[PDB]
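A reminder from the course coordinator: this example appears on the midterm review sheet, so study it carefully.

Given structure:
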């Protein structure tokens, strides 16, 4: 009512080296599903801003699958929980939730009728469970394999069957309902990571650590062939195969491997038609893959989403982003570009209007970036816990990190402020106020530990928040500072910002207070009202271009919009702006538009009318 979300640049899937990423998809195949944090993402192969998120799991999400009917989605987590919910409405009403076993769910499978669900993983009491979706009633017994079950799939045609892959190196097949163990197959010599039936259920294939792909008769599970690459010796891949998927017509199979390639195989000839190399880096290993009626997607170890053109044997599109906590944002002066930085030093550029992303490479930092700022000349200023302040030139690749000027800092940078043109940059460090201008770094030692910084638009003031529960305001001339005000807070300062017109300075502290000061009144309190609505640490603050409204992001998952003109009015509270996640950064793109980023790797845009 008082606000609405206009867009989302979604988190990439969570990844773990040498671990499979299982994807789900909608009936039309127009959208895929994957997980990060405690959420389930439904990403369209069409849009880049209309992804949908479902965040009701209380534990780290592992896999999510939408029913053939398309009305429901069954998602599991590391604790063995499987939630079944409506995907059609913004309410996502829970139909059923059930703890299938004590341990992480690794894969889930809906049956053709959308009446049954099979879940496999690492339980103490069992590695798999099959039950009716609406009632939660057991539909059989998946006992049979000795170790964790990594993959599971229903035979889409009658007579119904269920196949599974396990860490015991075996493939198992069950018949029913009620489902019961039928047989085990031992073609594989290492962990089985993926087992899948073709669209008509006449056949299914398996693959895993041994790098081989075996083909089987869908009803009895008798081996009918193996896919081998003529360029290799009796194997399909030169390393572990984390997943395989069938083309819509069932004539081809695509596999994703640790050998950094995606291969398209012809089912009839059992030969590889095309090998699609992603790159030479360990980040290029392929950990998951899925072929829908509208797209073939493969996931890199770095989280990137690769759209494959099976016909041309090439990568059509690649979506970048983040799967680790976003820690800083900056938007271009012209409002067309947004830069985002994360806890692991990765930076992405985004076209604000389209959502198209670009990953800065090589990385500007190998660790935690606590500040980033773009300037009117394309330069990109950054500070990181590798104790450096770097300036990266622009649009030649867009940001040739390869030509960034690095400057070692004396102490850890916790905040960054840079003038519009990049003439002056100031970094609040643990034991210094670092100033960079005209290619020279000057570091003023301070007797307190700073926590944040803000530079006034006219470049005359520098406000430094401190762990001494004080806001130190200085008049700046070159790298020479003169303190003109020391503002006392009841707790440690967490963030600061000057309004564009320089009329106000706002500071937030660990007591959860948000306090603005009148610069014209020598930094005296602008109002007596207590703006203490956040129920958790305030992590960031930013002013609207109107110099009246401001916004704060907090560890309590919300963004709050404050109004300097009506201090006693209740503020606008976007509750759960970033569900189960802290809002680390916020910026006003215009008088009624805010962009937020959180620990959840999500970047959200909000419209907040006057």
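Designed residues:
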């Amino acid at each position: 009512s008082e606000f609405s979300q206009t867009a989302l640049f979604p988190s990439l899937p969570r990844t773990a080296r040498g671990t499979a990423v299982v994807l789900g998809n909608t009936p039309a195949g127009d959208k895929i599903q994957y997980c990060n944090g405690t959420s389930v993402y439904t990403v369209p192969v069409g849009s880049l801003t209309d992804t949908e998120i479902y965040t009701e799991h209380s534990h780290q999400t592992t896999v999510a699958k939408t029913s053939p009917s398309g009305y429901y989605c069954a998602s599991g987590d590391v604790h063995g929980n499987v939630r079944i919910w409506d995907t059609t409405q913004t309410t996502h009403i829970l139909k059923t939730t059930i703890p299938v076993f004590s341990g992480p769910v690794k894969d889930i499978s809906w049956d053709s009728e959308s009446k049954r669900i099979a879940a496999v993983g690492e339980g103490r009491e069992r590695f798999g469970h099959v039950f009716l979706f609406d009632t939660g009633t057991s539909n059989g017994n998946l006992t049979g394999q000795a170790r964790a079950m990594n993959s599971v799939d229903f035979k889409p045609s009658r007579p119904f069957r269920i196949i599974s892959g396990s860490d015991d190196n075996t493939v198992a097949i069950f018949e029913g309902p009620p489902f019961k163990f039928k047989s085990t197959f031992g073609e594989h010599t290492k962990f089985v990571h993926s087992v899948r039936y073709n669209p008509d259920g006449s056949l299914f294939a398996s693959t895993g650590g041994d790098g081989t792909i075996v083909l089987y008769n869908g009803v009895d599970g008798t081996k009918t062939g193996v896919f081998e690459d003529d360029s290799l010796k009796n194997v399909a891949h030169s390393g572990s195969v984390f997943g395989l998927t069938w083309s819509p017509d069932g004539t081809k199979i695509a596999s994703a491997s640790a050998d950094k390639t995606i291969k398209i195989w012809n089912v009839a000839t059992l030969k590889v038609e095309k090998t699609i190399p992603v790159g030479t880096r360990i980040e290029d290993q392929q950990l998951g893959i899925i072929w829908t009626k509208q797209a073939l997607v493969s996931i890199s170890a770095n989280g990137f989403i690769n759209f494959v053109n099976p016909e041309l044997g090439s990568i059509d599109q690649v979506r970048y982003g983040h799967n680790k906590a976003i820690t800083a944002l900056s938007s271009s002066a012209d409002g067309k570009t947004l830069f985002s930085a994360d806890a692991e030093g990765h930076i992405n550029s985004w076209d604000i209007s389209t959502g198209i992303s670009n990953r800065v490479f090589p990385d500007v930092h190998a660790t935690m970036i606590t500040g980033i700022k773009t300037t009117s000349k394309g330069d990109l200023f950054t500070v990181s816990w590798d104790d450096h302040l770097k300036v990266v030139p622009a649009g030649g690749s867009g940001v040739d990190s390869s030509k960034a000027v690095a400057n070692k800092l004396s102490s850890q940078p916790l905040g960054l402020a840079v003038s519009a043109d990049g003439d002056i940059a100031v970094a609040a460090c643990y034991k210094h106020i670092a100033i960079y201008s005209h290619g020279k770094l000057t570091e003023v030692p301070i007797s307190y530990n700073s926590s944040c910084v803000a530079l006034s638009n006219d470049k005359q003031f520098v406000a430094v928040g401190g762990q001494d529960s004080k806001v130190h305001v200085y008049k700046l001339s070159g790298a020479s500072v003169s303190e003109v005000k020391t503002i006392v807070h009841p707790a440690e300062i967490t963030s600061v910002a000057f309004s564009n017109n320089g009329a106000f300075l706002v500071a937030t502290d660990q007591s959860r207070k948000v306090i603005p000061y009148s610069v014209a009144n020598n930094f005296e309190l602008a109002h007596t009202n207590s703006w203490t609505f956040h129920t958790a640490k305030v992590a960031c603050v930013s002013w609207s271009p109107d110099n009246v409204r401001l916004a704060t992001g907090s560890l309590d998952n919300s963004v709050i919009v404050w109004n300097m003109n009506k201090p006693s009015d209740h503020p606008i509270i976007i509750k759960g702006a970033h569900a189960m996640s802290s809002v680390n950064s916020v910026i006003w793109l215009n008088e009624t538009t805010i962009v937020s980023a959180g620990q959840d790797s999500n970047i959200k845009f909000w419209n907040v009318p006057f």
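The domain at 11-322 is CATH 2.130.10.10 (Methylamine Dehydrogenase; Chain H). The radius of gyration is 27 Å.
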